[PDB]
Structures are given as structure tokens and as C-alpha cells.
């Protein structure tokens, strides 16, 4: 006997009990006589063009490929949904959000980073964790990560940082000058490197780590009055990390440790399951906040904005097919339903236009219209039409312009964003100098005990080691900032390494 | 009040009735509060990028156009069916023609050739007459022109043809030079030359013409006894050409002239309809044709072969959406069921390859999967995965490769190509050469009388007095090679016109 | 000897006297032996999939075509120069206008607007007419019209208008009704639409007819000092049209007329120029000017703001490739180079993102490395990398993220966006009450005499009379609004119409 | 100091300084002002559309990705030139060959085959060596992998194959039921298999392997005369592979171990370099040699037909950007100058046309025109145009038909191709039948000591240990098909496994 995961054309076979099996079918459905061996002339003769069985099926297999993700494209993603435990439609009318105990059917993505699409699971990285809600307004995308922070809070510098975080332009190799010569540039990281290469930067499996919608959000109820929140979808299967040890190890033993563990743990009747929360900042206490609310390197202190639970999370049906309800997944943050709204969160603004972008070359302009990506549980109708692979009805004969004296879709007024003021010139405003340490100091001496507070030491000058000098010096002049006692212990590793 | 195509938005409003407009959403099912003004700081203040409303709409707006089709651009459609009322087993064994009765949804474009998609109905040029069957052995697609007949037998010079016949590469106009260099130098053009400046070379709509399969073909019936023939879908209507003067007044007066004809003939109950028939062909009557029976510049006289009367061809439904039902239609002369198979034409040979080649551009690389062109009436499976824009269930999980153990798709015996014995040196044999008046001359002096002569050569003439005098001259011969007084009657012009 | 344009092909003969023709190839640069014979197993054969030249020119074939531009399909372009004659720096520190008899290489392309690629010239329609600079600072792309104003001024309803504008979805037919639901629903357009079926609604090609900014822009000095400007580029040919029955004919003698007129031209060393003219307003005249300053429905009294001489435009060269040159031709009203700004005009503003975002589509991720639109006068050095049909040396092996210390480009703070101030709450502000008819009751009674609102209103009622009664209804009223008399004219006229 | 690829950057900024750095710039070139902050109203305040410097930016970063190779993605690249050393005229017209000393350019790309783009370098699996020669008759394209044979014999099996070394359509995880389920069934792999496992079965890097034609070719000498050849080159610094230990950790100690060792040997002058030699064989000698000559999964013994040396491969330029160079380059068999043809090999005709095919789709319909692709050592010359994303000039204002009488390029009749008489029934003939054994067994004893049969067999258990029961039972009845001791040494170490 096998598992799940191995004994998957097992089960397949059995299923398809004792009916016969169909008909090899060409692509525009013609029966095919054999398929083993090519059309020719004589036994040992050309190849007759004449042989279409041959083209239509080869014509396919050179184009199954399509591009991965630029980021995060390696990952594995179930479904499931989302239940309501708790009445805080007093905060955000959304509709997900009902009454207790409605249930919104789901779907899950859960990816590294840096990594591509043979990489493996088992590495230092940060993670995705998104959600997709399918509500009656619409989809709504929790697109999350396993930190409640980032290393930048300017979209502008996203790209150059993720190019930082890959291959050399020309040796095609990871670069550590590249990785540490910006983080050293930047230390707005240094409370997010801080989270990397703690005990938590390499879970063990998807279901033991915890999910944050990360930037600060907008909650607007039923009344319109307005305030600012922060998503937390903890882990009930509890944290787990793996040992740096571990880790490469399974790296590669089975790089794909991710995928088949949270795949099992489906099969095998356990799903996983996680409790959404949220933290409340009205708009009186964002003035008062000694930070920027918004900023993205930046927390909310559980003691002074403190959790709600609203709902649960389970998973609980694996893909059927992997590249059609996993590969081709899109998850478009701008896809807020009335209820929830962006803040002036400047990375959160960014992620508004690239993700919708994105989709449109990864997949194709009617992106929304594969199946994982359709809102099946609304009604989509407006005045869009055409474009390539246009599948549905393209709505029929319907009125295309708006408006019209024909009846065609009309827009509800209700669904109106929040009213807000603004008042400022239009400039490039500097957030590089928002305060990189403060709140990195009270993690070090007060979030991690001396026994892991050692650990990361260690973690970073192993990583740190292989950069050029004048880097180190630099990254350490960051440390030390933080906690002299901080960069003096990873100072000291250097240097042993340094021989 | 005025016809159903003018009527068009009148009658989809009335057809809404009691129903209440739909709700305006976002490409991702949310609703808008406001389509009509844009989200900004002030009323005369910025856009900003969290205006993702405008974003979604004119982001879908940028990518409604894909490439037209590289020839017969210009064109409409329609649905309807095939009737079979004769039985023709005793020659194939397609499952369409099963038996007599057996009635089988098919669809149907016509378009031009040269022009562009907002070219001119009433112009000189060859008709597309393409068809589509949608049986249970996959469909079958019946691409034929409104000729039997082309202006060349060697698939290697469409594409310098068509370039002939459409712009010059620097001025982008049509070239008069271009257009009669190629034609004064390849004379196997001269027959459908003829054809094209004849009355026929401007039907009355598409409802008053005949639809030829030109290429012969192949058909094996139940005990696998090959046979070849022709196809003819001969008009109900009458055969009904427009005059030059007309042509030229719809021209501008109303460039979509056909395609305003077919809806309403629809429209209003009139469903035009063609008798289908086809001759036939033995191997050995073949091997004693005086021609290369596969020149594809050449006809069967129906004294030898009598046509044979299959079934109907009705057309009575029209689009409920142009560009996903029309626009996006493709036709592949490939999909042919078990019971018809290609022929040695050369011509032939070559759309075998182009069709589905010039869709996976067009459209994409799964268009099959498009609702108009999946083979509906027959169930696709087979090896073929992934792929952009993959909807379906990509075959969920089902074993990817064949041969395999666990009961997935199989062979067919029983459709497997009719096999044939062929011989000789491999290489390029110039077909330069193989008779390019006889069946003109025939045309010329038997097929036409006078008046049609008259007008046949002022239409010639009318257009080749434009181009070089060279070129003249060089046609001016091959005419007369078809016949002296051919020749001298549009030289006679020709001088006039050069006054 | 024919015009230039007919004589192409003969003059690149004797352009090339003695050559000798070079060796035909396959794309890889393989000599082809023989181009026009298909390679088949005897001379009446299948065709081997071994025949790869063919297969590689049927493949390209395959793939001519790219999608036709969404707007402005049917154009005609050229290239020439713009020269400075008119000090102007006191209020743009603009390289290209950097000092007298200054000359920058521009390119242009002029065009109808809601025909396709097949469609004629000569049709009542705005015309566009876009001007490439390839300046110095990159290149700047003012992409204006023949008239200064326009339909609406919110771009949200421009994907509506230009859906009225074109087919309708089930017919694929011109719709009045669609065309007069929509205006007469949108009074904001009066103003257009009473220029377009004015006498300018055809000109005599492009030659004859003046270009416009149509938005009003921001001009910025050396000392950092703004102002709000319009741009105008009048016709040095003359003001010339096309009578309503001209157009009419040459629709179907010539729908290439502007294209032919504008080559042959050039060709014959009569090169069209404009000169080009800016209207000034000062930041606090526009807090007090009577109407909205960014209102694209609204034009500059010259009385109140004059024109300012600033240098000439002449075109002097024509495009060798239609298809490389013209039909790839890009132009982003984002180009705007160090001195020239945008303004708040709503229309202006969404028109930032779709160019860029739609040439990412009909042309490529890679678009502005085509030759056209490379900006090969300026050096482009950023942190951009990759993506499909990538050439050049993808800036090499130079450093890909920003900040590093490795010397790679780096940001030029002189080029800093001129700062404002902007205040008041975030929403959708309502643009549709804003003086819909004191300017074009202005047009009609001043700016036109008698002869010229007869021919309008014929015109007018000449299409309108084809919309059903309650929407003519509903657009006379609106006519009334402007002006007593220009309802009862039109309405007149439709009265007859109606029998 | 460390590595020459470690210090790219520190080179890079070596090179580079004594410079300024340049100024950055949108990809219009304009100079932008500040790339680190993005555009607001006040600080706090929503991101603007004003803000095109971010949408450039970000737009592209959204499109760096392109679909990676469908097999092979992983790779190593670079670049240098092949010195003729020996005289072989007498067999090939072909150029390249022309004279002793001869040096022609040559780009190489070394990879394994069913890793995606971030598996690692290390790990059993054959090894891909495409060498491409850019010739003045256009470029040759000499697809080769590390190994003589391969798997399959026909075409059609191929992608069948191809999914049964990856994922598994619903886990995604690699699948030893789909691998050993397929080469169970399909004996006909045993040869390949045998060599997979064997030692070779994971090369030291890409310099420790040789390159193999592994098809039959044909050859032409300036008299008209063929043979049929093979294609052999060995490399010079020896056969050197890694253990199954070494590998595995070098898997996740080093994942790129191929690109780093492949470039710093380049790096430090130690260019590597490999000789190529011909095996050959007579037309008659062809027809009385044993099996298939053209049988992909047998070979010819150097003892009857010999290795002729031909040149030098020498490798001494690393690619100066890894994605314009290495990720674009496209090889395609098809391409093949005069001297050179295709053989009735199946498997290989197949490939004549799935490569520029998937071309087309993974780089784009001009992929030709990507520098490194382009046959500049050549000079193209055609009649064909457009498609998307077109450089050059599109060939200018050349008449694009043929024939013509503009003296365009004309074909060369010194390039016919050789014919070879053909003849034989057409259709799908079987090949599972060609002896599965012979040469197989040859190895189990001849080519292979004792020592290598041993951990030989051990490897095959290693892996088919994790395959369902009755998988190994077919399993080890072809390799006792092969030979007894074969299958039994298996067979034992088999139920071991199995505790
Ligand atoms: C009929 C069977 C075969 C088919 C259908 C086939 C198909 C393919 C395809 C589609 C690719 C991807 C091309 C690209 O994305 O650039 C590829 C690449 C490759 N194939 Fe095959 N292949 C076959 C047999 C073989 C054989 C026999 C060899 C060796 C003689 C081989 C060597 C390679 C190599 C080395 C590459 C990588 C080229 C590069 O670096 O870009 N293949 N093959």
C-alpha cells in the first residue's frame, strides 16, 4: 500500500470502474485510428504532412508552457472556505460577512518567493498565502503573505529589490552582493530581515504557519463611517518551522515537501484550518499613531490594538487538475468588495495596478474568464466586450454603451467608495528615513529569547559571509543600529568565517 | 418602423420586458456606485491609481482587437443545418450521412478575399463559402470559395498571390502591377482569371451563389472502397449577379451590403438554402482523366460526371454575437471525420497545414476550446494538456501519457486512413505547364456568348489598362493563347484606353 | 509615366541599376533551390513534412498580421522635421525648443477614427494627427486631433462612446440609433458634434486641415515656473474640404485617397508643413476663467489668449515600409519630456495609462525598441530587463536594481516634476451639468453664416433622420437648448424626411 | 578574492569606472527625477496616474517572464567557434566544411530535460548539447544530446514520453508510476535506459560529456553524391561524472553547479573544446546493414563504420546578458545549409517541424530576427513580411511576390535538394518491432565492466523501487528479455527494498 498523493492514478483507475475507456479523439474531436506511429510512406519512407493526427497533437504539446509568475511562482494551492464566528458587520458591511455562520466557498495559493517553478519548498524565503473569496459582491482577494511586514514601503523600488533577490543578469547565478548590497542600502528591511532569518523563516509545511493581509485596510459599514484595520488569519495546527539541518535536506529529497504534506493532509480527512482576525484603528487614533499607520515595514502592537475574531478558514478539496485550478490562478488585490477599500498604504497602491496587469500577459486579457478566476457567485454584466480567447456569450446582443435608453446594466449608487479629504502637493515625498530600528529593537530584546536571538545571529552571518567586505561593514552598521550587542555578535561570526 | 437589423436594440429591450437592469460590475463581479465619472482629489484635482473601476474597464477596452484573419477578413455568418435526403453510403462512411433524414447542425461564413475588415461588400472578388458540420465523429469542416476553380495549382505561391492582390509594401495602395505582373506570369491563372471578370465576379449577396469544394477529395465507405469526388452546394435561391454600376454605388452607399442581406433574409423567416451535391471518380477513370484530376485549375465535365444529389443546406438562425460566434469562427479543412480524406492536390496538401496553424495565431493556441468551434456533438479526449487559456477541465486528473495502465482513451481501428500506394522520385516536379487554356478556351467560346465576351474583356480591360505596358503586352499574349480574338479584343480596349 | 505612387516598384528597379538579384533564403538564411514547386514523392504525391521551406515561408504567412489599432485604424503617415523659430524659453525649458533654428526629427501619422483598416478616407470623422519628436530627454509624443476639443471629458464614457461609435455587437452594422442614443444622452457633446458635421467634418485630405493639442497642458521653465497651455499647428496648405458628395464618390473610386495624396506629395518635393502656435494662461487666470480650464469640451477665445508663434513642422520624407514605420507606430501623450507637463483634464489624465497599456498588446511588452519608436536620440539606461522579443544587449551585464553602489544609471533630480497643491475629498465628481452650450451656441451663430448652418443641419438631419423618432426627439430638444433656430431646422428637415 | 562569477559586479563597475554614471530614464527615455518615491498628493496622501515613471517601470517588471523551454528549460549557454581540421569534402558541398583551418562562429546550449527553470544541474537525466553554426549559407543547427540514442522511435511517442518524466496532472509531484509505467510498456527504451542509469548518467558538469548527432544524416558532396552520416564529438577535458551521492548534494549545496563551473572555466582562459567526427555510411551499405539504419534507439559500431574527424568545437565567450543570449537562443534542426539533409528518420523528421513551431509560440513569430538567432554570417532574402514585433526594415520597399519583374531575389537551382526515389504503400507502419534486445545486450557484457553492472542495477531498483507491484514485474521481464542476470540482479534487490 502507497499514499494518497503516489497512489493518485491508482484511485483514478479504480474509479473509472469497469466502463470501457473513450476514444483517443484528434483535437477538433476525430477518431483516431492509431497514434503509436507516424503516417510514412513505406516502412521506412518521410513523413506524410498528410499525417494531421500527428501535427494537431505535437502543435499542442509545443504550447503548454506559459510564463510563471514573476514572483512566487513556485507553490501549490486547495480549496475550501470561510465561516463567520463573529458579528463585526458593525465595522464593514461587506456581505462576506453577513451574519454568523455564513459560509463563502474558497480558494488557496501558497508560494515561496525568489524561487521558480523547479525550485523547492524547503528554503529561507518568505511565503504566499492568498486568498479568493467568491462572494455575492463580486470576488474578493486576500492576497497574503506569513508576515505582517516587508522589507520596503515604496512600490518603486519592488522590482529592483525582487531583481536583487534573483539571478545575476549575466552569470544567471543567486548573487549575495546583489542581495546585501541593497538590503545594506536600505534598512527599512531590517524588521523584515529580522523575521527571514528567524526561527520563522522556513516553516514546515503550508499548514503550520500563520497569514497577514499585511497592509492596513479600510472597513466601511453599513452607515458609512470608516476605519483603518489589519488582517491575521492564525494557524490552528499550530506553528513549525525546520531545521536549517532539515531543510536542505529535504530540499532535495523531496523539493516539493510542501505540496504533497498539504495535499495529503486533505486526503487523509485532515484539513487545516485558520482563524481570521482583524485590529481596529479608527481614523482619530491613525493622527496619533508615533509611526506611519500605513507604513508597511511597520506593526500594530497586539497590546494597544488588539484582535477580533470574525471566522474560520478550511481547506478541504485538493485540485483536480494542477495547471488548470492552481498554475492559472489570479488573485487581483484591487478585487475589493463594497465593505473593504485600500489605504494610502503607498505599496498597497502599486499592488492596485501591477497584479491585474500581470494577469492580463501571464494569462491572457479575458484572464477573469477561466474558471478558478469566474465569480460564479455574482453576476457579472457591464459594457466590456471582445478580446482574444473570448469564451462565454460575450453577453449577447446587449446594449454596448453606456448609458443607454435600452436597459442594459445600471450602476448602484450604494456601492460608492468612502468619502475622504486630502490636502498637499504632488511630489515624490521621502519614506526612506520613516524610522528603520525602533520597533526591530523591541523584536530582538523582547520578541525572540536569547536561545533563537542567537540563532538569527548565526542564520545571517552564513548568508552575510559570502558578500564583499565593504557590504558587511555596512549591513553591520545597520545591526549595530539596532542593538550594538546585535551587530557585535554577528560582527564576530564574520570575522571566523573570515579566517 | 424599419428592418430587423435596424430593429436590432428596439427588439432585445422588448425581449427584457418586466426584468429589471442588471447590477454594473467590475470584470471581477463588483459593482460600481458611479461608471460615469472618475474618483480624483477635487473636482478639478488628479486621477488616482486607486480608481481601479476606470482601470478594469479601460484595461479590457485596450485589448478588444485581436489580428484579423490574413485573408477573407471581411465577412458574416450564420447557423442552421444539413439535411440528408439521398443515400450515398454505398460511396462514404461518414456518420453525417448515416442516413437519409439525419439532420446536422452546421455553421457557415462568407466573406470576401483581398479586403480588410472594413472593406467593401460589392467588390470583384472571389467568395468564401466555409461550413461547418458538427457530427459525432468530430466536426468536419467543408472550407470551399464560390468558385470550383482557383488561379494556381502549387500551395507555394498563395502566399505571393495573395500579396500580389492586396497592398503595395511601401504605399500601402493596391497596385494594379503587382496584381497583373503575377497573373501575366503565370497563365495557369488565366481559367479563374475568366471566371472572376464574369458576371459571377460580383454576386447579389450571399444568398444568390454556389459553394464549390474545388479540391477533389476521398471517400471510403463501410468496406473501406475508396472513391474521389467533388463537392457543389449549389444555390435554392438562383444564381443572381450584381452589376458594375450597382456594386459601385453599394460600395459606399453600404459596404456591409451582405452581411445587412443574410440577417434580415434570416430575419424574417427567409432562410436561404443550397441543394448539396457531388460527382464522382474511380482511380482508373482517374489514371485516365486527360488532366492531374488534384489541379486544382481544372473542373470534371458533368457530361462525364453527372452530379449527385446528397442533402440540404439551410441556414435559419442568426449570430446573438458577432465577434464570438463570427469573428472567431475557424474553420480547419483538416477536420474531416472517418469517411472523407484529403487527395493528392497539392493545394489541398497545403491547407492541411495553414488552417490550424494560422489559429493557434489568430485566436490562440486552444481555440478549439472557443464555444463556437468545440466539437460540441462529439466528446474530446485525449493526451493533449495545459496550453494559455485552458477552460474546461483540462481533462481534470486523467493519465497525460499513452500507452498506459489505468484505463484512459484509446485507438480506433475502424478510423484509420485508407491506404494508398504511392511511388517515384522524391523532388519538386514543376507543374508550370500543365494546360493552361484548354478548359479556358471551352469557357470562353461554349460557356459564354457574345454579350458576356463583350463585358468579360471591357472588365479585363479596365483594370489591366493601369498596369505597364509590358505587362500589358505579356498579358495580351496568354489571352490570346486562350484564343486570337480573346487576345485582340481586349488589346482593342487596351489602345483605346492608352489613347 | 504614371504618379509616384504607381511607379514604386519601377523606380526601385532602376534604384538599384546594375545589382544583381540576391539569393532567395529561407528565414535561417538558407538558399532556397527552387521557390515555386512544392517537394512531393512523384509529380502527383503527398507533400513531406521534409518540404521545411515551404513550411517556413506558410508559417509566416501564418502570422502577418498584428490587431488593428482599437481607435484610428485607417491611417496614412510620414516623416519630417520640426524647426524652432520663435523664442518661446521664457516658458518651457524644453530641450526641443531649447534655441532658435533648432531642428528635431519627427514623425507623424494621421487617420480617421472609428473606420477599420479596410474602410476609405473620406468619411465624416475627427482625424487624428500624431506627432513623434525624438528630442534629446526621449522622445515627446503630441498625439492631437484636427479639431481642439472633443465629445466628452471623462474618460470613463470614451470605451461607451467609441462602442456607439462602431458596430453594433449582433448585426455588425453602422446603428444610428446607437450613435444618437448616446449623444443625445450626453449634451456634453454638442459642441463636436457641431463641428464635426460642420464643413471641416471632411477634409481634402491631410494636407489641408490644422492640429491640435485639444488638452490644455503645463509648461514649465528653468526657474521651476508653470503655465497652462494649448497647442495648435495650423495647415501652411490652406483650409480645404470636401463636399458631401465628392467624399461620396472617391469612397468607392479611392478609399486610399489621403494616403495617395500625402505620398505622392512628398514624392514630388512638395512637402505639407503646419506651423505651430501655443496658447498661454497664467495659474491665476485660470481660478478665474469662466469655465472649466481642463474641460476638453471647451476652447480658448483667441481674443482673451492669443497665439504664439513657436517653429514649423515639415514632412519631407516618406516611409519606406508601410507596415515597419507606420502601421507599428506608437505614440504615448506619457512621452513628455523634462518642460512639459500634463493638466488635471480628466481625459487627458486616463489617456497617461491606456496608450502605453494598449501597445503593450497590439504590439508587444517590448514596443518601444521597434526602430520607429526607439527613442534613438536620447540613451535609455534603467533598471528594465527582459521580457519577450527583447533586442539590443538587454543593457548587458550592468547592475539591475536600484539603489546599488556599482555605478550603474541614476536618477537626475533637475528632472522633477513641477510640484502643486491639490485639496479637497476623494470621489467622483459629477462633469456633466458644465456648460454644455454657451460655446457652441457661440459656433453657430458667429463663427458660422448662413450657407454654412444649412449644410449642418442637413448633414445633422441627414443621419439623425435614420434614428428612431424618440431619440431624434430627445436630440432636437437638444439643439433647441443651444439655439431656438438650430432645433427647427434640423427638426424641419427630419419632418420632411419623415415623408 | 573569490570566483570570476561571484565577481561580475565588482568587474562590471571596474571596467565601467573612470565614467559617469549614466542618467536614468523611462523606456521613452526621458530622465527621471526620482526613482525611489513614487508620486502622491501630500504625504500620506492615495498614489496618482500623474505617476507614469512607476507605470513604466512596473508594466514591464509585470512582463519579464516568457514561457521557458517545454523541455530543457535548464540550462547553461555560451559561445565560440568550430576550426575544420580535416579534409571532408568529399562527402559535403556544405561550406562550413569548405576548407582545412576554416573557423566559423558557434553558440552552445547545455540542459538537462524534464527540470523546470529552477530545478538543479546535478542530477541524473541526458543532457542536452545544441550547437548552432552560423554560416554564410544561412545557420546549421546541430541539435544534439550527450548519448547516440533515445528513448523512443517515432515521433508520436515523443510527448506521450515527455508527460511521464514530469508531474502528475493533479499532484503535480514527479510520478515513478507514470515513468516505469510507460518504459514498461515500451520496451524499446531498454537501450537509453540502460545508459540513463549507467555512470554516465550524471556528467561532472557540461565539459565532462560528449555530443551526439544521435539521428542519421545525409550528405552531399559538390557532385551530387549522398551518404548517410552520424554526428560524434567528444570532448577534450575527458568523461569525468559524479556520484550519487556527490550529485545529490551538490543539488542543494550548489543547483547551478553546470552555469558556475561552465562559466569560470571560460572565465580563467581554460576554454573547453571538443572534437567532432562523422560515421558514415553507403546508400548500398545502408540497405544491406542489419536493422534500421535510421533506428533512433540503435547505433553503428565504430568497428564496420569508423569515426572520421571533421574540426574543432572550441568554446572561449561567456554570454555578456544570460536572458538575451541563452534564454532566447533557438536552435532548430530543420535548419540545415546544402551539404546536409534530413534522414526518413521518424523521430527526427518529426522534429523538422516542432521546433520553429513551439518557437513561434515561446519567443514569437519574428524569433529569427532576435540577434543572436539572426544567421548573420548570411544575408536574408525572401518574400515574406510583417508579423508581430518586426525590426530591420522588413526588407524595404521590395516587391513581395514571386515570381516578378523587379528583379528581386530569385532561388538558387545549385540548391536543390538530393533526390532519393521513393516508393511504398502509405500508412501508420509499426515500430515496436526492431529488436529491443540486441544492442542492448552488447553493453550489459561488452561496453560495460563488471563493476558498472553492478551499482547499475542498483540505480534501476533505486528509483523503480517506488512503482506499483506489477509495474517491476514488466519491468524486470524486459531486462531479463535482455538478458536473465539482468533482470534477476534487479529482481533481487527489488523485494529488499521493499523491507
Ligand atoms: C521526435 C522527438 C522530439 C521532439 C518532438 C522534440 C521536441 C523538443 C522541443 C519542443 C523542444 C523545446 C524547444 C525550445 O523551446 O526551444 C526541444 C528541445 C531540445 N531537444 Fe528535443 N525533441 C525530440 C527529440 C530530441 C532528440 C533526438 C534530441 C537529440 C538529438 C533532442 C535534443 C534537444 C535539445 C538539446 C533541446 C534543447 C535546445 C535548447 O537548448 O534550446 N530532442 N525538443
Same mark, same amino acid.
Given at each position: @500500500? /502507497?499514499? !494518497? %498523493?503516489?497512489?493518485?492514478?491508482?484511485?483514478?483507475? $479504480?474509479? /473509472?470502474? %469497469?466502463?470501457? !475507456?473513450?476514444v483517443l479523439t484528434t483535437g477538433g474531436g476525430n477518431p483516431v485510428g492509431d497514434k503509436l506511429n507516424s503516417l510514412t510512406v513505406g516502412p521506412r519512407g518521410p513523413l506524410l504532412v498528410q499525417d494531421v493526427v500527428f501535427t494537431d497533437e505535437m502543435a499542442h504539446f509545443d504550447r503548454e508552457r506559459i510564463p510563471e509568475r514573476v514572483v512566487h511562482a513556485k507553490g501549490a494551492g486547495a480549496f475550501g472556505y470561510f465561516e463567520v464566528t463573529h458579528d463585526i458587520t458593525r465595522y464593514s458591511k461587506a456581505k462576506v460577512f453577513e451574519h454568523i455562520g455564513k459560509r463563502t466557498p474558497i480558494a488557496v495559493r501558497f508560494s515561496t518567493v525568489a524561487g521558480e517553478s523547479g525550485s523547492a519548498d524547503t528554503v529561507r524565503d518568505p511565503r504566499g498565502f492568498a486568498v479568493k473569496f467568491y462572494t455575492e459582491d463580486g470576488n474578493w482577494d486576500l492576497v497574503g503573505n506569513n508576515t505582517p511586514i516587508f522589507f520596503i514601503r515604496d512600490a518603486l523600488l519592488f522590482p529592483s529589490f525582487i531583481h536583487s533577490q534573483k539571478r545575476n543578469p549575466q552569470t544567471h547565478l543567486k548573487d549575495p552582493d546583489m542581495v546585501w548590497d541593497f538590503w545594506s542600502l536600505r534598512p527599512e528591511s531590517l524588521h523584515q530581515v529580522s523575521f +527571514?532569518?528567524?526561527?520563522? =523563516? &522556513?516553516?514546515?509545511?503550508? /499548514?503550520?504557519?500563520? =497569514?497577514?493581509?499585511?497592509?492596513? *485596510?479600510? +472597513?466601511? @459599514? %453599513?452607515?458609512?463611517e470608516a476605519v483603518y484595520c489589519k488582517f491575521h488569519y492564525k494557524t490552528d495546527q499550530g506553528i513549525k518551522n525546520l531545521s536549517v539541518e532539515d531543510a536542505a535536506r529535504l530540499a532535495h529529497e523531496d523539493p516539493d515537501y510542501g505540496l504533497r504534506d498539504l *495535499? @495529503? %493532509? &486533505?486526503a487523509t480527512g485532515n484539513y487545516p484550518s485558520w482563524t481570521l482576525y482583524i485590529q481596529v484603528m479608527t481614523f482619530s487614533e491613525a493622527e496619533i499613531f508615533p509611526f506611519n499607520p500605513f507604513d508597511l515595514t511597520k506593526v500594530w502592537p497586539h497590546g494597544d490594538y488588539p484582535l477580533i475574531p470574525v471566522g474560520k478558514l478550511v481547506l478541504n478539496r485538493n485540485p483536480v487538475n494542477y495547471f488548470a485550478e492552481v498554475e492559472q490562478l489570479a488573485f487581483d488585490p484591487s478585487n475589493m468588495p463594497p465593505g473593504i477599500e485600500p489605504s494610502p498604504d503607498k505599496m498597497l497602491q502599486g499592488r492596485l495596478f501591477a497584479y491585474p496587469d500581470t494577469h492580463r500577459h501571464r494569462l491572457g486579457p479575458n484572464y477573469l474568464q477561466i474558471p478558478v478566476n469566474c465569480p460564479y457567485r455574482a453576476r457579472v454584466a457591464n459594457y466590456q466586450r471582445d478580446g482574444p480567447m473570448c469564451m462565454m456569450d460575450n453577453q449577447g446582443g446587449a446594449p454596448n454603451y453606456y448609458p443607454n435608453s435600452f436597459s442594459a446594466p445600471e450602476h448602484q449608487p450604494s456601492a460608492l467608495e468612502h468619502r475622504t479629504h486630502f490636502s498637499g502637493d504632488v511630489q515624490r515625498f521621502n519614506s526612506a528615513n520613516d524610522d528603520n530600528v525602533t520597533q526591530v529593537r523591541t523584536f530582538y530584546l523582547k520578541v525572540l @529569547? $536569547? $536561545?533563537?536571538?542567537? /540563532? +538569527?545571529? $548565526?542564520?545571517i552571518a552564513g548568508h552575510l559571509k559570502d558578500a564583499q567586505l565593504f557590504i558587511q561593514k555596512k549591513a553591520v552598521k545597520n545591526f549595530s543600529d539596532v542593538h550594538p550587542e546585535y551587530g557585535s555578535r554577528i560582527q564576530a561570526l564574520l570575522d571566523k568565517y573570515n579566517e
Open positions: @500500500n /502507497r499514499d !494518497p %498523493a503516489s497512489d493518485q492514478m491508482k484511485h483514478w483507475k $479504480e474509479q /473509472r470502474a %469497469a466502463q470501457k !475507456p473513450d +527571514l532569518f528567524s526561527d520563522r =523563516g &522556513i516553516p514546515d509545511g503550508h /499548514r503550520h504557519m500563520d =497569514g497577514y493581509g499585511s497592509h492596513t *485596510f479600510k +472597513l466601511v @459599514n %453599513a452607515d458609512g *495535499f @495529503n %493532509a &486533505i @529569547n $536569547e $536561545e533563537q536571538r542567537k /540563532r +538569527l545571529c $548565526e542564520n
